[PDB]
Design a protein around this nucleic acid. Structure first.
Ligand SMILES: [Mg+2]
Ligand SMILES: [Mg+2]
Ligand SMILES: [Mg+2]
Ligand SMILES: [Mg+2]
Ligand SMILES: [Mg+2]
Ligand SMILES: [Mg+2]
Ligand SMILES: [Mg+2]
Ligand SMILES: [Mg+2]
Ligand SMILES: [Mg+2]
Ligand SMILES: [Mg+2]
Ligand SMILES: [Mg+2]
Ligand SMILES: [Mg+2]
Ligand SMILES: [Mg+2]
Ligand SMILES: [Mg+2]
Ligand SMILES: [Mg+2]
Ligand SMILES: [Mg+2]
Ligand SMILES: [Mg+2]
Ligand SMILES: [Mg+2]
Ligand SMILES: [Mg+2]
Ligand SMILES: [Mg+2]
Ligand SMILES: [Mg+2]
Ligand SMILES: [Mg+2]
Ligand SMILES: [Mg+2]
Ligand SMILES: [Mg+2]
Ligand SMILES: [Mg+2]
Ligand SMILES: [Mg+2]
Ligand SMILES: [Mg+2]
Ligand SMILES: [Mg+2]
Ligand SMILES: [Mg+2]
Ligand SMILES: [Mg+2]
Ligand SMILES: [Mg+2]
Ligand SMILES: [Mg+2]
Ligand SMILES: [Mg+2]
Ligand SMILES: [Mg+2]
Ligand SMILES: [Mg+2]
Ligand SMILES: [Mg+2]
Ligand SMILES: [Mg+2]
Ligand SMILES: [Mg+2]
Ligand SMILES: [Mg+2]
Ligand SMILES: [Mg+2]
Ligand SMILES: [Mg+2]
Ligand SMILES: [Mg+2]
Ligand SMILES: [Mg+2]
Ligand SMILES: [Mg+2]
Ligand SMILES: [Mg+2]
Ligand SMILES: [Mg+2]
Ligand SMILES: [Mg+2]
Ligand SMILES: [Mg+2]
Ligand SMILES: [Mg+2]
Ligand SMILES: [Mg+2]
Ligand SMILES: [Mg+2]
Ligand SMILES: [Mg+2]
Ligand SMILES: [Mg+2]
Ligand SMILES: [Mg+2]
Lengths: 100, 215
RNA sequence: ACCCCUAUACCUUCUGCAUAAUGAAUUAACUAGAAAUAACUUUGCAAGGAGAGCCAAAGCUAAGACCCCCGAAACCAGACGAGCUACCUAAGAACAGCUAAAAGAGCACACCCGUCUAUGUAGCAAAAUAGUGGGAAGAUUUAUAGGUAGAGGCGACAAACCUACCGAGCCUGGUGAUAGCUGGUUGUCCAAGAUAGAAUCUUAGUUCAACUUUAAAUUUGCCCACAGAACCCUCUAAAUCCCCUUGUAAAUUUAACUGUUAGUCCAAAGAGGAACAGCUCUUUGGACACUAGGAAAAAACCUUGUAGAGAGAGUAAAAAAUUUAACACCCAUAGUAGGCCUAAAAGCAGCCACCAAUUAAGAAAGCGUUCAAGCUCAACACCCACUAAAAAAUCCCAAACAUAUA
RNA sequence: GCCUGUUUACCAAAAACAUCACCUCUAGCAUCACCAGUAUUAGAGGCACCGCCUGCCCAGUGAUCACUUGUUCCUUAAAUAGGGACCUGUAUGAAUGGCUCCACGAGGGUUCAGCUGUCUCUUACUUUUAACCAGUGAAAUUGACCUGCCCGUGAAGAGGCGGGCAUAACACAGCAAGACGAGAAGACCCUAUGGAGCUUUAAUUUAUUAAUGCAAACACCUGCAUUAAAAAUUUCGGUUGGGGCGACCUCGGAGCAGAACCCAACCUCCGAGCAGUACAUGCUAAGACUUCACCAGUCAAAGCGAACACUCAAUUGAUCCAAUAACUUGACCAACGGAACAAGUUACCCUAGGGAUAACAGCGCAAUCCUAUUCUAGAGUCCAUAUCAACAAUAGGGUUUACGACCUCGAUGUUGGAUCAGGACAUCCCGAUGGUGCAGCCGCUAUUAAAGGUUCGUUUGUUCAACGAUUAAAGUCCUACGUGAUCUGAGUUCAGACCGGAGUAAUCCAGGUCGGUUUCUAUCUACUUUCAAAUUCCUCCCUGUACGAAAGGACAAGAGAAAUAAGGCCUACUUCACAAAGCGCCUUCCCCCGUAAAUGAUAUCAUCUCAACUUAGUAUUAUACCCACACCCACCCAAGAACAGGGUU
C-alpha cells in the first residue's frame, strides 16, 4: 500500500493523554519504512502553526516559490513542473519540514 | 574455503559425475545404487520373490534398487512379493516395502539372530555388502580392514544364506584379494570379479560376486 | 642550452567519445575521381538554329563545368603433373645369430616403422636428434621401368594420399572476377553547414521524405493578443495549436546536386505483467561531434560564442560545511491479608468496586516472593536546582591557518 | 578388440579399419577387365576366429481324409446366397541377439613385490652452454621518446592527465612484475541476400545411361513419349539467450502523450481476414484531407439523369501474367510493398568483417542475501540485553531484474596445483582486557592487537562434501585463476573413435568414455645481501598449591628441552675430500594502550578527566655493523661473470 507525506497511517483515541500512547507509537513510527512521528491534535496544529509562522517570519528576501513561479534565473530549466506546487518542500518521496 | 589440491580434484570429479546427476534425477539416494543396477543388468542377480539381506545399507539406495527389482514394495501384482532387510549402525531413512534394523553390526551373533528372526524362513536368498572402513589415507591398511570385514561376513554367511545363494561384496584391490577369492572359490561354484563403469576409474574398488553356494 | 610557466603524438574506425582500437623504423622514387541526360555560365545567330539527319509555342549552335585506388574465399575452359605419395603391372634384390615340430611362432642384428620422454622450436631439420620402443620369412622391406589425372584417380575410410599449403592438385586464360566488407584517397585560403520518418530477403546497405548547399523569382516569414479548439471515463499538470499588433528580416516558390541519420550525456515528463534504484525505449529542451574560462584531472555540468596584433582595462562562472548524551535529596503509618476464583494470591496470576484515618500515601505505578516477607515511585515536611555509530585490501594524501576593517 | 596386419606423411596407432570363419544380395556366361574363368564360380556387401544357446503368419478343428474357409468364374436387374474349378509334384525360418573362452596387444583402468633424487630435501662433480679475449656476423621487433613511484581520474585499465613524492650522469651481469610484451595460429559469438564439402522426403531438369511403347525402316539405327538409375544447377527470409517445444511478421482498438497533430521500441491484452440491405452500390465535377515519402487511401458543393453517392473499428493485396467478344475476374503472393518456381548439415570447413578480446560494459539504490546497530515481542527455571532472537528499521558490502508468469544450463585466459608471495582485518592461534547463567580446568561473548605463525596424507557414500592422523592454530578475504614472455591438471574444445539418445540421411547432443603441437635470443620500466632487535610448543618447580564437598585442577616468577624462522660455519658425523654441502654444529636482544585505579570541580556529595591532573605508561626505542687509501706491471687468492676487492717482507 502506498503512503504519501502528511498521511495519517494509524489513529488512536480514548480516555488517555498523548504521553501515555506516545511511547509505543514512536516505537512503531521508527520501525516504519518512511520518516514518521507520533502526533496529537495539539502537536499537529502546533507544527502547522510553526511552519506558517516561519513562512511569515522569514528574513530571506528570496524564497523557492517566488523564484520558481517567476522563472527568475531561467530556473524552470532545472526544476520539475511539480516543483511549482511543491514549492521546494518535497524532493522525490522525501519531505523537508525545515524548508519554507 | 581453503580447499587443498586433492579436495578440489574430488569436488570437480563429483560435480562433473553423470551418476550423481542421474541419481538426483531418478531420486536415488547415492550413486553407488547404479553399480548394483549394472551388475543386475549383467548377471540378473535379483529376481521377484527373492529374500535380500543388505549390509551397510545407509543411505539406503541399494535397498531402493533391491525393493524395485524383487517387487518387495509390491508395485507389480503379477510379480511375487520379496523381502529386503537392511543393516547398518548409522540411522537409515524409512523406505516403503523395506525394513531397516539399526543399530546393528553383522559380525555380532546377537544381531545375526535378530536378522534371522525378522527374515522369513530364517534364511536369506541374496546378501549384498557395500560397507567400507573410513579411509585412513593408506591403501594397504584400508585394504586389510575391508578384507577382514568381508571375511567376517563370509564366516557368518552359512547361517543366513540358503544353498545356491548369491553374495556380492565390495573390496579394495590388494594382496589379500586373491586369498579372499580362493575362499569364495572354496564355498561358491561361480566367482566373478566385476568393475562397473559407475565405479570410478581412479578408484581401486571392485566387486566379488559369488553364485551357487554349497556348504 | 637546461632550470621557470603552459601543453593528454598523428591517421583511420566504431550510431557518439578518445585517452580505446587500426596503420606507420626511416629516406627516396612510384602510388588512387574516368562520362551522360537535365540544369547553370559565357559567346554566335534568332522564329528560327545547326557545314544534310536533329530540335524549336525563344529557341538552337558551340564551349566551360560533376562521377577513385588496393584486397578474398570462389566458378568455368584449356593445358601440365603418379621421379613424393595411394594402388597396381613387369622383371629383380634383401633378411646375422639363438630357441623352436616348425608357424602371417618367440628373443634378437641389419632393415622398416614411430610408443613415450627429453632436446630442438628462424632448428641439423618447412618434422630432426638421443634414449626408449613396435615389427623384423612376411598381409614383410626395397631398387628399376611402366600404368591409373581432377565433373577424376587411388584408398585394410583416416575425408587418407594424388610434388612441403587436397571437403577436391597445379598452371594459364576468362580476369582489372565479384566484394552493401576492411584499408587507403595527394597544393593553399575563405564561406554556408548536424539527428522527424516510411519501405525494403530490411536494420553493416539503398530509395523517397526531412535537414543541409547553391542559383533564381516573388512576397511575406518569425515573434505573436482578444476571440477560438469534447464529451465520455470522474477527473489530469507543465503546456500546445491558432494568432492582429509589435519587435524584427526573413520566408515561400523555382532550377540543380550531392551528403547525414540505432547519435551520446544532462534536466524534465513518461512507457515496458500496477519493479520509486538499474536496463531498454518515447517526448520536450540543453550541451557535445565547433572556441575559450571554471568545477582536481574532466565530450555532454557552469560561464562564454564570429575569429588578427598589443608587455592595457572592466568583468563572468569560480574556494563546502559540521563535533553530540551528568542529575534529584528527603521519606513512607494504617481501616485490611478490599471482596470473588484460587492449595494461597495477601498492592503487583485474573474480575469488579476504587472508598477511607491521621496533617500527609494510589485498595498501588515499577521490581521482588509458590504465596508471604522486602526495595523503590507518586504522598507530607525540608527548600533544593534540573536541565548520539562504523569498517578492506601497494602508501595518509596539497602545504597550512580560528584574531587588521568586501 | 579374437589374433599377425593397416590408418590421419607433419599434434590422434586406438576401442577405428582390415582379418580367417559366418551370413545376405546379384549373375546361366566366351576372344581387352571379371577371365583365356563358369554356381564348390564371380561380383557387390554385412559382421568379425573358434565354441555354446537362440528358428515357423506351411489353413483350422474332428476322425491321409471330409468340409467351409481362402481364391477365381457364372446365375442373379445386380445381389444376398446358390451352382462349378483349385488350394496335395513343396515348406524350413536370423546380412537375427546373447554367452563364456585360448592366445595376443607401445590399447584404457586397478594391483603384488622390488627398485630408485619422483619426493621428504636437496647436494657434489664432469660436459655443454655461459661470461671474458680474438675473428666472422643474423632474426622477429621499432609513431616519436629527454621512457620514475604512490594515490586519484579516465564505466575497467596511466611512464606520459591531476595532487603529492623522488631524481648527477653513464655501462656490464641477472630477473621476469608491467609495457592489455612480440610472431603467427587459434577456440567463442555474430554478420554477409560471401563461399565450399556432404545429405535428402528442398526446388528445377532428364542433356547422359537403361528399359518400355508408338512412329520410321524392312534385330540395329533414327524421332517422339513414358518410366527408373545416375547425376547436374541453385537456395536455405526476418524477430524471439543460445537450444528443443512453441509464438510472431498485415490491418483495427486500449494502456498511450493527461489539452492541435505526431510520437512508448520491446512488452500485456484484445479483436479482423466478414456479413447484412440496396440494385441510380448511375454519370460527371469545384474545393479539400491524408497514417509523416511514394504507391495507395478519404470527404465533397454544383451539374446530368433518377427518387419523392448504405450499416459496420478493421473485414484486406501492386506490377507482370492468365482467362475473356466486351464488361470483368483471378494469390491464407498471411514473410501481407508481394523474387514465377529452391531444404537440411558441417566437430573437414574457407573468406571478408564486427564483437568480446582481458579487469569495466548494468556507474549515486527498487527486490533479495549477509554483516553490524536500533527496536524490546519472545526463548533463556524467575530475568530483553550471560547467551540467543520474531516482525521490522537504519548503515555497509554482494547478487538479480522489462516479460513464452514454459523443463532446461548457461558462464568459459574459466578455474586447480607448483614457485614466490604483496596487502586488508571483518583474529584461527599466540598478547593484553570487560562481562558471564566466570568455584578451578575448559568454555560462551565483546574490546584491543596484523609483529609472528597457520600440517601431512586419502576419497566407499556425500551438489562447493568428506575421511585418517596431527596441531598452539590448521582464519576469512583482496591482489586481472594474484602470479602460464617462471612451470604444469582439467574445462571451454574441437581434426580420429565408440556408447546412450535424436535425426530418412548427412550429422547432432545443451549426455558419457578413450587419444590428441603454442613459440619467444629481454629493447624500456621496476627490481637484484632494509637487517641488528625471533616465535611457539612441551616438560619440571611452584604443586599437586590456590579453588572445590569430591571428581578434578590454575595464574604470576623461574628452570630445562625441543621445533620452526633468520643469520653463519666445517671440529666431528654424512654426501665427499687442498674444497663445496646437510642429514651436522653455532648464535638469536624492546614495548604496544584496551582498560584498572587516586585527588578533584562544572553539578561545594559523588565522579579515572574529549576538566585542569596523578600512577600502571615506555618515551624518540637504542645499541650493534660499516668507516684509513699505493702501483692500478705482474703473480697469487679463502675475492670474483667482466670489473672490482685482499695478499705479495
Ligand atoms: Mg581417486
Ligand atoms: Mg605497426
Ligand atoms: Mg609412372
Ligand atoms: Mg611411381
Ligand atoms: Mg608382378
Ligand atoms: Mg634369420
Ligand atoms: Mg614373427
Ligand atoms: Mg618379434
Ligand atoms: Mg595401404
Ligand atoms: Mg571414419
Ligand atoms: Mg571425419
Ligand atoms: Mg601440394
Ligand atoms: Mg573490387
Ligand atoms: Mg563557418
Ligand atoms: Mg520482400
Ligand atoms: Mg541484409
Ligand atoms: Mg548491408
Ligand atoms: Mg501572424
Ligand atoms: Mg541509446
Ligand atoms: Mg517520593
Ligand atoms: Mg586387434
Ligand atoms: Mg606380427
Ligand atoms: Mg599389432
Ligand atoms: Mg602411416
Ligand atoms: Mg599424425
Ligand atoms: Mg603418433
Ligand atoms: Mg571393426
Ligand atoms: Mg597398442
Ligand atoms: Mg647471455
Ligand atoms: Mg666477440
Ligand atoms: Mg631485419
Ligand atoms: Mg593507476
Ligand atoms: Mg601525473
Ligand atoms: Mg640490463
Ligand atoms: Mg604507453
Ligand atoms: Mg549467396
Ligand atoms: Mg555465387
Ligand atoms: Mg502525406
Ligand atoms: Mg509508425
Ligand atoms: Mg449532389
Ligand atoms: Mg518480406
Ligand atoms: Mg513487408
Ligand atoms: Mg504500410
Ligand atoms: Mg569428430
Ligand atoms: Mg572491440
Ligand atoms: Mg576485437
Ligand atoms: Mg519469557
Ligand atoms: Mg558477466
Ligand atoms: Mg605474506
Ligand atoms: Mg579488530
Ligand atoms: Mg581470486
Ligand atoms: Mg605473465
Ligand atoms: Mg599415446
Ligand atoms: Mg689490490
Amino acid at each position: 500500500t502506498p503512503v504519501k507525506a502528511g498521511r495519517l497511517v494509524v489513529e488512536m483515541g480514548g480516555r488517555c493523554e498523548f504521553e501515555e500512547v506516545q511511547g509505543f507509537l514512536d516505537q512503531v513510527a521508527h520501525k516504519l519504512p518512511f520518516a514518521a512521528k507520533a502526533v496529537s491534535r495539539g502537536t499537529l496544529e502546533k507544527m502547522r502553526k510553526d511552519q506558517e509562522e516561519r513562512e511569515r517570519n522569514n528574513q530571506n528576501p528570496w524564497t523557492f516559490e517566488r523564484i520558481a513561479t517567476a522563472n527568475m534565473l531561467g530556473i524552470r530549466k532545472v526544476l520539475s513542473p511539480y516543483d511549482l506546487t511543491h514549492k521546494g518542500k518535497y524532493w522525490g518521496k522525501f519531505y523537508m519540514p525545515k524548508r519554507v | 574455503k581453503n580447499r587443498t589440491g586433492a579436495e578440489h580434484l574430488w569436488l570437480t570429479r563429483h560435480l562433473r559425475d553423470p551418476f550423481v546427476k542421474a541419481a538426483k534425477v531418478e531420486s536415488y539416494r547415492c550413486r553407488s545404487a547404479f553399480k548394483l543396477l549394472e551388475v543386475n543388468e549383467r548377471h540378473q542377480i535379483l529376481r521377484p520373490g527373492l529374500r535380500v539381506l543388505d549390509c551397510g545399507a545407509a543411505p539406503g539406495a541399494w535397498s531402493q534398487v533391491a525393493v524395485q527389482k524383487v517387487n518387495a514394495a509390491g508395485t507389480d501384482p503379477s510379480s511375487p512379493v520379496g523381502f529386503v532387510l537392511g543393516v547398518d549402525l548409522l540411522h537409515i531413512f524409512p523406505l516403503e516395502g523395506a525394513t531397516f534394523l539399526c543399530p546393528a553390526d553383522v559380525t555380532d551373533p546377537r544381531t545375526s539372530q535378530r536378522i534371522l528372526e525378522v527374515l522369513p524362513g530364517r534364511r536369506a536368498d541374496v546378501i549384498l555388502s557395500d560397507m567400507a572402513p573410513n579411509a585412513t589415507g593408506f591403501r594397504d591398511l584400508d585394504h586389510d580392514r575391508l578384507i577382514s570385514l568381508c571375511l567376517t561376513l563370509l564366516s557368518v554367511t552359512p547361517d543366513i544364506l540358503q544353498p545356491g545363494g548369491t553374495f556380492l561384496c565390495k573390496t579394495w584391490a590388494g594382496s589379500q584379494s586373491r586369498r579372499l577369492q580362493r575362499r569364495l572359490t572354496e564355498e561358491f561354484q561361480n566367482v566373478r570379479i566385476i568393475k562397473p563403469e559407475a565405479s570410478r576409474k581412479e578408484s581401486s574398488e571392485v566387486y566379488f560376486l559369488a553364485t551357487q553356494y554349497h556348504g
